[PDB]
Amino acid sequence: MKIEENRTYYQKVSIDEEMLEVGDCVSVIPDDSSKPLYLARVTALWEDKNGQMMFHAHWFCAGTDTVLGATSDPLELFLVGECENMQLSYIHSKVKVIYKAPSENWAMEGYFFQLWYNQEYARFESPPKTQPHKFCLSCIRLAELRQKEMPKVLEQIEEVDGRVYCSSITKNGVVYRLGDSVYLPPEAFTFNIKVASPDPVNETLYPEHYRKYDAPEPYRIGRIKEIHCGKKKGKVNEADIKLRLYKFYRPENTHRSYNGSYHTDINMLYWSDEEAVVNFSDVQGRCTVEYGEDLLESIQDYSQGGPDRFYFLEAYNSKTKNFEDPPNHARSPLPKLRTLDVFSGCGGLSEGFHQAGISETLWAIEMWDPAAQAFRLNNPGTTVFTEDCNVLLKLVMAGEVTNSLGQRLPQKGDVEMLCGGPPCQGFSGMNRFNSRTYSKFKASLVVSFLSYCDYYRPRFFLLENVRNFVSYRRSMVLKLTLRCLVRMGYQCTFGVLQAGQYGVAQTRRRAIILAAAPGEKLPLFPEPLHVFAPRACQLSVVVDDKKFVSNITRLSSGPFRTITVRDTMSDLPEIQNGASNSEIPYNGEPLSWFQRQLRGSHYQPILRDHICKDMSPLVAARMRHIPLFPGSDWRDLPNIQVRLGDGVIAHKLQYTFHDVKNGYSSTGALRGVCSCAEGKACDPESRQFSTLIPWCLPHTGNRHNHWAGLYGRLEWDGFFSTTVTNPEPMGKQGRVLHPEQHRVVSVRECARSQGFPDSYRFFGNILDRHRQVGNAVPPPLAKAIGLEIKLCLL
Ligand SMILES: Nc1ncnc2c1ncn2[C@@H]1O[C@H](CSCC[C@H](N)C(=O)O)[C@@H](O)[C@H]1O
Ligand SMILES: [Zn+2]
Numbered sequence: 001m002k003i004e005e006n007r008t009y010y011q012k013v014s015i016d017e018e019m020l021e022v023g024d025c026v027s028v029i030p031d032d033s034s035k036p037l038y039l040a041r042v043t044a045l046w047e048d049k050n051g052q053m054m055f056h057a058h059w060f061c062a063g064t065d066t067v068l069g070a071t072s073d074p075l076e077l078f079l080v081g082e083c084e085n086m087q088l089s090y091i092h093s094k095v096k097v098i099y100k101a102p103s104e105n106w107a108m109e110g111y112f113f114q115l116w117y118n119q120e121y122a123r124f125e126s127p128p129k130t131q132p133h134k135f136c137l138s139c140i141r142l143a144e145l146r147q148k149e150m151p152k153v154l155e156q157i158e159e160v161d162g163r164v165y166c167s168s169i170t171k172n173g174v175v176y177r178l179g180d181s182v183y184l185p186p187e188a189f190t191f192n193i194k195v196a197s198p199d200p201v202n203e204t205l206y207p208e209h210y211r212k213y214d215a216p217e218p219y220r221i222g223r224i225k226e227i228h229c230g231k232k233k234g235k236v237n238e239a240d241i242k243l244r245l246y247k248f249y250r251p252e253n254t255h256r257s258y259n260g261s262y263h264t265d266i267n268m269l270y271w272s273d274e275e276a277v278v279n280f281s282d283v284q285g286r287c288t289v290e291y292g293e294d295l296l297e298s299i300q301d302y303s304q305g306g307p308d309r310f311y312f313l314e315a316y317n318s319k320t321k322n323f324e325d326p327p328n329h330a331r332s333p334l335p336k337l338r339t340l341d342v343f344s345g346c347g348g349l350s351e352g353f354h355q356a357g358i359s360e361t362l363w364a365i366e367m368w369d370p371a372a373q374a375f376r377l378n379n380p381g382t383t384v385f386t387e388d389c390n391v392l393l394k395l396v397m398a399g400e401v402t403n404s405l406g407q408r409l410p411q412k413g414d415v416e417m418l419c420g421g422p423p424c425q426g427f428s429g430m431n432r433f434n435s436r437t438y439s440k441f442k443a444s445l446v447v448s449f450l451s452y453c454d455y456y457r458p459r460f461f462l463l464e465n466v467r468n469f470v471s472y473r474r475s476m477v478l479k480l481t482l483r484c485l486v487r488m489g490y491q492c493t494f495g496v497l498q499a500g501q502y503g504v505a506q507t508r509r510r511a512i513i514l515a516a517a518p519g520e521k522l523p524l525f526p527e528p529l530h531v532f533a534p535r536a537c538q539l540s541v542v543v544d545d546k547k548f549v550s551n552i553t554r555l556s557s558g559p560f561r562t563i564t565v566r567d568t569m570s571d572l573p574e575i576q577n578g579a580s581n582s583e584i585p586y587n588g589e590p591l592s593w594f595q596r597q598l599r600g601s602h603y604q605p606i607l608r609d610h611i612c613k614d615m616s617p618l619v620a621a622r623m624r625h626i627p628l629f630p631g632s633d634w635r636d637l638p639n640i641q642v643r644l645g646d647g648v649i650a651h652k653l654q655y656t657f658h659d660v661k662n663g664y665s666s667t668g669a670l671r672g673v674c675s676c677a678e679g680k681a682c683d684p685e686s687r688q689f690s691t692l693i694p695w696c697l698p699h700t701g702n703r704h705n706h707w708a709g710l711y712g713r714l715e716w717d718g719f720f721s722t723t724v725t726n727p728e729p730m731g732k733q734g735r736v737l738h739p740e741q742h743r744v745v746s747v748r749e750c751a752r753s754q755g756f757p758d759s760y761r762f763f764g765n766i767l768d769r770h771r772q773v774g775n776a777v778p779p780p781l782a783k784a785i786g787l788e789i790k791l792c793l794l
């Protein structure tokens with residue numbers, strides 16, 4: 001075809017008398033007899049100066065080598081960026097590979113390949129459509145990637161003492177110029193302020209006390225003052241770009257620290273003339289930092305206007321610890337997708353999407369009446385079907401335009417975005433999928449949701465669920481759900497996100513399956529916004545020993561400080577156990593940035609649903625006896641008799657068995673409450689009733705890390721455990737007591753832990769409302785995901 005200097009390209013070779021062609025597919029026999037046949041596309045054929053007869057192999061990935069594993073169609077191949085030069089003598093045979101393109105009438109459709117597989121993120125995506133003697137998509141992709149990845153100097157200024165100063169550089173698609181701000185790891189530099197690093201009990205009175213035996217810092221931010229690099233071979237050394245920066249102080253970086261900055265905006269900074277030198281390699285991203293007064297709009301409008309937007313109004317003198325005005329040199333010089341929300345709940349997911357500005361939920365389906373009503377209260381514009389999604393779908397299959405109540409059913413073409421959180425019962429744990437199990441899955445609500453996707457063929461598809469959706473039955477639920485989306489021709493991916501990293505004071509890992517129709521861009525998962533406890537941000541998923549991660553790059557830090565229980569509910573009036581007045585005055589102002597977001601700027605004095613469960617006299621007595629010291633839970637309880645009302649008694653727990661593992665106490669007491677503490681079988685009579693210290697907690701404490709957290713108080717500096725449908729002191733994660741008051745958290749406090757605005761309405765009795773709040777997708781999580789979809793609508 002063309003004769004380069006070192007290679008001669010041919011269009012077609014004869015291999016054992018059979019022609020082979022550019023465009024053709026080929027098999028190569030693996031050395032490892034256990035591997036599937038290697039299959040490739042021939043992208044070039046040539047001879048080298050060395051007499052070797054060669055081809056370039058753009059390898060395919062077999063289905064069984066993707067997350068899909070054995071669920072995948074044997075005959076479906078996927079494109080991947082894996083290619084290399086190979087000797088023609090290795091070809092085993094030519095193969096037929098068909099490109100199954102999405103029909104032009106795809107929306108109405110209620111070896112081969114169709115998608116490109118990204119093996120690091122488990123993304124199936126439409127193949128590039130880009131068109132051309134050697135054309136190899138794999139090669140083209142890596143080049144574009146390398147070009148994107150590498151540091152490059154856009155503009156040099158002048159050399160001064162063996163260093164070229166530049167006015168502009170770039171890495172990963174971001175152009176950084178003089179005067180721009182940059183994100184940097186916490187340890188890139190230090191502030192000149194100095195920061196100093198930060199009892200026995202009677203064990204018969206407190207017999208369980210003995211069983212009592214973290215978020216990183218957010219980014220450093222600095223304004224670029226100069227950019228200078230070294231030189232190599234008389235040329236710019238791009239592997240050596242360095243930035244000299246003006247340090248910005250976050251409020252908690254000044255002497256005020258955190259206790260002095262509880263009330264400041266999470267995006268407010270302080271100017272400083274302190275300078276730091278950093279390697280370009282360490283720059284984690286670019287951010288906008290503007291002096292408040294130069295703003296053409298309001299700080300709030302500027303702040304909510306875009307991502308990575310900070311501001312300052314004062315400088316901070318590290319030396320006199322005073323805040324003067326900033327020096328002069330610090331100054332400067334879409335259509336909404338029509339959405340169907342299945343398993344709508346009270347609408348946490350639709351609310352986040354609405355906030356993102358990308359969607360309008362026109363239809364919601366919610367079988368449970370209270371939740372359906374809650375959804376209507378918040379969405380006057382949506383047709384809400386209080387109905388089982390299965391019977392609604394049958395009504396549409398039956399040709400009905402309307403249900404019996406006059407409500408207009410959504411039809412093909414109506415639905416542009418389909419979202420929902422289908423309850424996945426009876427798949428928990430990890431035994432293998434058996435034959436009957438496949439029937440269970442076909443009848444399941446997750447399949448019903450997929451059926452909606454298949455019929456309505458929406459542009460975008462979102463399935464949210466509990467973290468363990470990705471692991472149920474050895475990940476077969478996840479694999480079958482990805483397989484269904486691929487079979488339909490959808491682009492799709494999955495990931496786990498941690499709500500805490502999107503601005504809520506709660507540990508809540510959720511599974512998320514995204515899908516996009518052939519013609520769209522498949523969204524990315526949103527980059528963490530807030531730093532959160534590392535132990536709660538294990539987002540990777542292992543499927544058949546393969547570790548999958550999402551595209552998320554911020555694995556250690558992030559733009560904003562973590563949101564605490566204090567940020568969440570320090571402004572709420574004091575209530576008692578059983579409080580039931582659903583409309584009360586706040587009788588105070590928002591104190592935190594987080595409370596200002598959720599309460600609004602409008603004048604608004606009514607506080608809704610600050611009500612809590614009326615715990616029994618026994619549980620109320622226990623709560624009153626949990627100390628207010630941070631971390632306190634059931635192991636702090638005193639072993640005392642308490643008079644309950646009516647004449648009833650919380651009795652003393654009696655210890656009459658040796659715990660061979662835990663030994664005697666300092667008062668010479670025994671520590672076992674059953675014969676199993678001595679290695680023996682359980683005494684049937686062992687159980688003790690009505691005792692301030694719950695008998696079952698020492699009974700099995702050793703086998704469950706001492707049930708840490710049960711009857712536990714939230715910490716002001718900490719975060720909520722996963723917000724559940726019914727907060728119980730003794731459910732597994734029972735850290736549901738208020739930090740100070742002798743009661744469980746209120747419906748509203750639970751709603752604030754999910755990031756619900758205060759105006760957000762719920763419906764039904766107190767347990768109905770707890771259920772609605774606990775089931776929801778936190779609107780700040782939904783919003784972050786929504787904004788990723790917004791990128792795909794441009
Ligand atoms: N067959 C069915 N059809 C419609 N809704 C169902 C259903 N089975 C369960 N549900 C509802 O599915 C919901 C799951 S919780 C969904 C919460 C929602 N994403 C939010 O952000 O608020 C519950 O409200 C439950 O009542
Ligand atoms: Zn290639």
Ligand SMILES: [Zn+2]
Nearest residue numbers: 674675676682
């Ligand atoms: Zn026992």
